[PDB]
Each structure stands twice: as C-alpha cells, then as structure tokens.
Amino acid sequence: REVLTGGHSVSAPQENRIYVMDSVFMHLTESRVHVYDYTNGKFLGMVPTAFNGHVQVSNDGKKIYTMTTYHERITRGKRSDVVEVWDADKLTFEKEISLPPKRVQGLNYDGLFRQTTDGKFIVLQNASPATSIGIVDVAKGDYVEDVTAAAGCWSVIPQPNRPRSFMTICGDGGLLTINLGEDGKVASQSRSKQMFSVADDPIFIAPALDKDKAHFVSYYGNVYSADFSGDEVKVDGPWSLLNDEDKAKNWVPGGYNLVGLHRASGRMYVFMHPDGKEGTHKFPAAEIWVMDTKTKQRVARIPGRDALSMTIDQQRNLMLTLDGGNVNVYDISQPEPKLLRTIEGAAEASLQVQFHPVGG
C-alpha cells in the first residue's frame, strides 16, 4: 500500500526557514543545524556538522555551507578541516572543500564564518592559534587565499555595499578592510584609525550591520561605529546606551550574537542586564533595548527572556532571539517588538540562529 521514499525537499518555503546551529556541547562531535519553520515552529530537517560545526546559508538562498573538523577515527587519526556545500532544499551533501587544519574551533559567533556580499567567496576565521582569514572560492570549490594581514585580528564583518569586501577587528582597536578581487585574492586593503580602546572599553565583536556602516557595543554600554560609505572606513564613538537612571543600576550589554540592526529605521537591538560588573558580559538578557541610532537614545525596552543571541530579518521586520534552547520570534515592524511565539527545544546548546536569506 505504502512505500517509504527518499529524495524529498523541505516541506516549507525557503522564506519560512530558520537555522538553529546546535553545538551539542555535551556531545560536541555530533553538532548539527536544525531547520525550523518560524511561522509555526515545525521542525523541517537538519544537517549534521560533526565536531563544532559552523553554518551559513548562501546569500542567494540555494545552498547551505558548513564548516567542520573530521578525524579518521574521531579522537585519533588524521585531521580534515572542511567546508561543505549542501543543497538548501534537499538538505543533501554536494561538495567538500579542503581547508588547512586551522579553521576556528569555537562558539558560533556569526563573524567566524561569513561570505562576501556577492556570495562568490566564503570568508572564514583561522586560528592555529595564530590568526588569519581564509578565503574559499565557492564555484571552484577551493581554498584560494590566506589573509595573513589579519594576524592579531578577529572575525569577519562583510560590507553590504560592496561585492567582495569585509572588515575585521584588530588588536590596535581599529579595523582592517580587505577588498578581494574576482579571483578571491586580496585586491587591496586599508586600516582605520583606532575606534576603541582594547584595554579600557572593549567591544563585543557582533556588529549591528547596516548597508554602509556597522555599530558595535562595548562591555560598559558604549557604542562605536564604522562608516564604510567610502573606501576608507571612518570610525567614531563612544556614545552611551545608558542614561543616568540606567547607570545607577549598572546596566550593561551581555550575550554572544547580542545585537542587531533594523536597517529601514536605524533601530539597534541590544541584550542588556542590570548589576553589570567584570565577568558579566555573557550574561543572559534581562531586557532587550531598542535604540534609535540616529538620535542616540533608547526608544523601547522589553523583557529579554534570558536570551543570549539574536538575528534580524530586514524584509519581514522580524527578530529571533535564542536562550540556548528556545527560539523567540518577534515582529519588529514597530519600535516595540511584539512576541509572536516561542519554539521550545529547538536546540540543546545553540548560540546562533539565522534566517534563510530572501534578499538575493
């Protein structure tokens, strides 16, 4: 009467899909990406990612990229660090791209595994522990460039206004900009003036990324900006997230992927908690603050639901937050976010959620 078949595609349209990167830290060799429908909480499928996988979806929406480490016998034998290309609709493996055995092993900050705006190159963080940025040519399926200019820097912030440009945060408190050629090799580079004091006002690496500028929040609740509307990045800051009442209760930011920007309004979303002090920078959110980046003032504050990480969908005006296991879906079409639903048990140990790209 019935026959079990394979070869099927994900049951919900791409525009409904989100990707919860489950580190499964208790069993970190069996990390995976869980695919959910944010509109109804339905589990749609998954992609296995071996030891401490990282994930992103191609900017054109067609493919999923993972980054992972294998060994011949898991806990012994030869190491293989790879990028894998997977079909986004069939959730099937297509291609392995060999990396040098130094891909970053670490928590799933967005900036460790990114891509150029044009989608042609994957841009990833290495640590051996010496740092460099690796470039993968997706079409060729090859590792093509190793940006040693980025030694002592960390994380990749793509510039959405250029096809193959990105920035990284360096040990001087400034930014290094890399512009890749059409071959994925460095075509040019520049270094900004110092944006922040590494020692006195360290920033969180997570950008609140606009089309032509990025904002960063600091451990003490300050905000810095990098404007890349020109070839030379112009840096500024600090302005404070905090008013005097806020300062009295020691409110500070905390989390991992802890900020986001709604580009149409300029609203920046930040996880905050009271009673800040040394050692609280990864505390769960007591609140989400909504900042107007033009006026440099808060416009709204809502309960944080112990969230640690977030992501924003621009075109549907949505924010996801994630507490490690549960994903909260918010409507951010108006200045006060509205909670639509909570997807419980989306992961055992996730610090990263991402939407399927719809912007092309």
Partner: protein
Amino acid sequence: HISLNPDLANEDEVNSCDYWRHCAVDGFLCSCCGGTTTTCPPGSTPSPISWIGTCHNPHDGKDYLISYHDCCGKTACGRCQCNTQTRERPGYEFFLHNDVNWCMANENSTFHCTTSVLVGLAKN
C-alpha cells in the same frame, strides 16, 4: 480510509507513540523529523530492510502488516522517541526484532529516524 492515511490525519495523532500503526517502533518518528510517515526527512535514505509485524487498527477493527523501515545517513533526529513492543521478539526471530539498527545495511548506517509503513491487511 482516514485511519489508513496519516497525511490527512491530525499531526499530533500521527506523531504519537500511541498511534495505532506505531505498535513496534523503537526510535524517533520520522513524521516528527521533517518527514512524513512514508517519506524520509530530506537527505536521509530509506532502509531496504526492516523489522516487520502486525498492528491492530482500532478504527476499522482489522489487523495490518507493517514494515518498520528506518531513514538513514543522518545523525539522530532526537524527536518523538518511541519504544513500543507489541509482538516484538528477540533476535532469534530476527525480522520481528527492534533492538537492532534497521539501517545496518545502508550505504551509511547512521540512524536518523524510524517509521511504520503500511504494507496491507495481515496475511490470512
């Protein structure tokens, strides 16, 4: 009719270990894993072999032959774990036994999820 067609039924049920056809299921129900009762979640492969058995349909009162195929080649789904044992027998009656991985002969034997495929009325 309705009791034989899980795709038309309430998902809550189909996704339950008490659903009548899941009567000797050991593992994660594929219908909770991005698949359906008869379709593997994307990127997982059906097993060519399975344990089998009959289950009683309390709607139509008839007994049906079920093939408990797995989907394979992806790591554990983790959702809707069942451990039902109606008429299940040990490995000396191997094809009635559900404490083995029915992905064991797949190109990749990693177990993803399991399901309950309706073959037809029990043989008489």
